[PDB]
Amino acid sequence: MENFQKVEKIGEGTYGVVYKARNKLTGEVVALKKIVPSTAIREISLLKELNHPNIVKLLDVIHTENKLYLVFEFLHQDLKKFMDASALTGIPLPLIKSYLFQLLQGLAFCHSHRVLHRDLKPQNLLINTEGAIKLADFGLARAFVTLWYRAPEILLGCKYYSTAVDIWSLGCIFAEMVTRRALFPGDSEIDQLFRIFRTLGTPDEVVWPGVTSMPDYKPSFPKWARQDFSKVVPPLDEDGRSLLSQMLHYDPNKRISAKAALAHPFFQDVTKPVPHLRL
Numbered sequence: 667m668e669n670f671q672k673v674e675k676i677g678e679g680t681y682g683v684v685y686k687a688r689n690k691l692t693g694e695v696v697a698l699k700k701i702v703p704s705t706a707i708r709e710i711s712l713l714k715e716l717n718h719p720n721i722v723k724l725l726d727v728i729h730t731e732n733k734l735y736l737v738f739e740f741l742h743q744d745l746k747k748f749m750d751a752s753a754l755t756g757i758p759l760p761l762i763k764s765y766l767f768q769l770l771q772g773l774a775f776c777h778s779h780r781v782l783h784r785d786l787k788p789q790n791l792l793i794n795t796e797g798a799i800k801l802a803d804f805g806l807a808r809a810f811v812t813l814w815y816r817a818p819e820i821l822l823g824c825k826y827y828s829t830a831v832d833i834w835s836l837g838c839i840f841a842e843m844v845t846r847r848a849l850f851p852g853d854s855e856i857d858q859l860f861r862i863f864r865t866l867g868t869p870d871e872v873v874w875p876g877v878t879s880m881p882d883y884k885p886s887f888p889k890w891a892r893q894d895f896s897k898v899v900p901p902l903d904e905d906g907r908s909l910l911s912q913m914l915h916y917d918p919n920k921r922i923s924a925k926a927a928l929a930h931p932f933f934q935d936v937t938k939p940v941p942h943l944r945l
Contacts, residue, residue, distance in 0.1 A: 667728055667735060670698060680785065680803060681810055686740060696725060697741075701734035701810070709809040710736065716781060720772030722792055722802040741792035741800065742945050745839070748793055751944075753846050760939045762843045763906075765791075765799045767928070767936045769836055772801045774924035777829040781805050784827075786835035787815050788842070797940035813858040814848050815839065818869070819918050821859045823881025830918040833927070837913030844902045860888070866914060867892030874916040905932040 673686040679699055687698040707729065714724050726737040745765075749757065757765075769791065776783065783790075784807040793799045817834035819827050841849040850865065852858025863869075868889045869877045877883060895907055902910065909932045912922040922930075 667730060667733075670696075670737075672698070680790075681806060687737075695740050697722075697738040699736040699738060701736060702729065702732060706734075706809045709805070713781075713805045713809075716776065716779060716805065718772055718775040719798070720768045720800050721776065721804055722800045738802070741794050741802075743793055743943055744789050744802075745791035745793060745799065745843075746788035748941060748943070749788060749843065749846070756846055757843050757941075758939065760937050761797075761941055762840070763933065763936050764797065764938050765793075765843070766836070766840050767933050768799050769801065769839075770924045770927050773829075773832050773836065774928060776801075776804055777832070777924055780829075782808065782827075782829055783832045783835075784808065785815075786832055786839065787812055788839060791839070793941060793943070795940065795943050795945070797938050813852045813855060814850055816852075816858060817918070818859065818862055818916060819880070821855055821862075822877070822883050824918075825881075828918055829923070830921045833913050833921055833924060837910055840906075840910060840913065841899050844899050844906070849898075860890075863887065864890045865893050865898060866916065869916045877916070905930070905934075908932070 669689060669691050670687040671690050673688055673695070676684040676686055676697065678684070682700045685698045685700070687696050688694070689696060710724070710727055714727065717723060722741065723739040724736060725739060728735040728737065773783070781804065783801060783804050785803065786801070790802040791799055792802050815835040815838045817827065817831035820831060838849045850858060850861040852861045868887055871878055878885070895911055899907060899910060909927060909930045913927065915921040
């Protein structure tokens with residue numbers, strides 16, 4: 667721990683403060699997250715084995731007197747900041763497509779190892795000058811404020827949700843890159859839920875078998891009609907709209923998997939362009 671020289675504070679993460687650090691020993695520039703229960707210890711130890719080029723590498727874990735430090739590889743910017751930076755002009759479709767493709771590969775990898783993220787959002791998506799995008803904070807939720815990317819089954823009380831929640835979240839982020847506006851900016855659990863309802867229509871037994879039996883489901887939920895999908899993500903092409911609708915399917919079991927999504931015609935012409943970051 668004294669092996670680190672805090673270069674500066676990046677910001678407040680979900681589980682603590684994040685500092686840019688320099689390994690006084692190896693000189694490597696890393697990201698230090700100042701996060702303890704023995705169960706969370708084995709859980710994040712298992713995360714060290716979860717390596718993929720689209721997953722932010724957990725270099726080391728340092729436990730010392732209730733203090734838990736997670737040493738991560740450092741990336742220069744997050745997707746939230748990049749989106750704002752390219753808000754007026756919009757992120758080019760080839761870069762949007764490239765990013766979604768890479769995130770799906772990363773998700774496909776984690777999901778193949780029965781590891782869910784559970785909390786995908788633009789701030790935990792880190793990018794570099796080389797065109798790569800990675801998933802940050804993977805597995806930390808199972809281990810240990812924005813509802814915008816929350817899957818509906820989570821909002822309806824499902825206590826044993828699946829990998830499908832990450833697909834839903836990524837779909838919301840996908841739509842946000844395309845339109846330059848958050849898809850469902852809920853400011854309360856009920857507002858989030860109803861925002862989803864107003865756009866995708868209020869779910870029933872037809873589209874989502876067993877929805878009415880969900881814990882937080884109320885028969886009194888207003889019945890909104892599903893909106894024309896072409897009004898949701900204009901001007902995304904038919905392939906993208908097809909993929910997005912599949913990623914936003916109400917029934918978690920019918921929602922497209924990361925693996926399957928990678929096969930969608932939308933990616934037939936995927937390339938790896940680089941973003942222009944002003945570091």
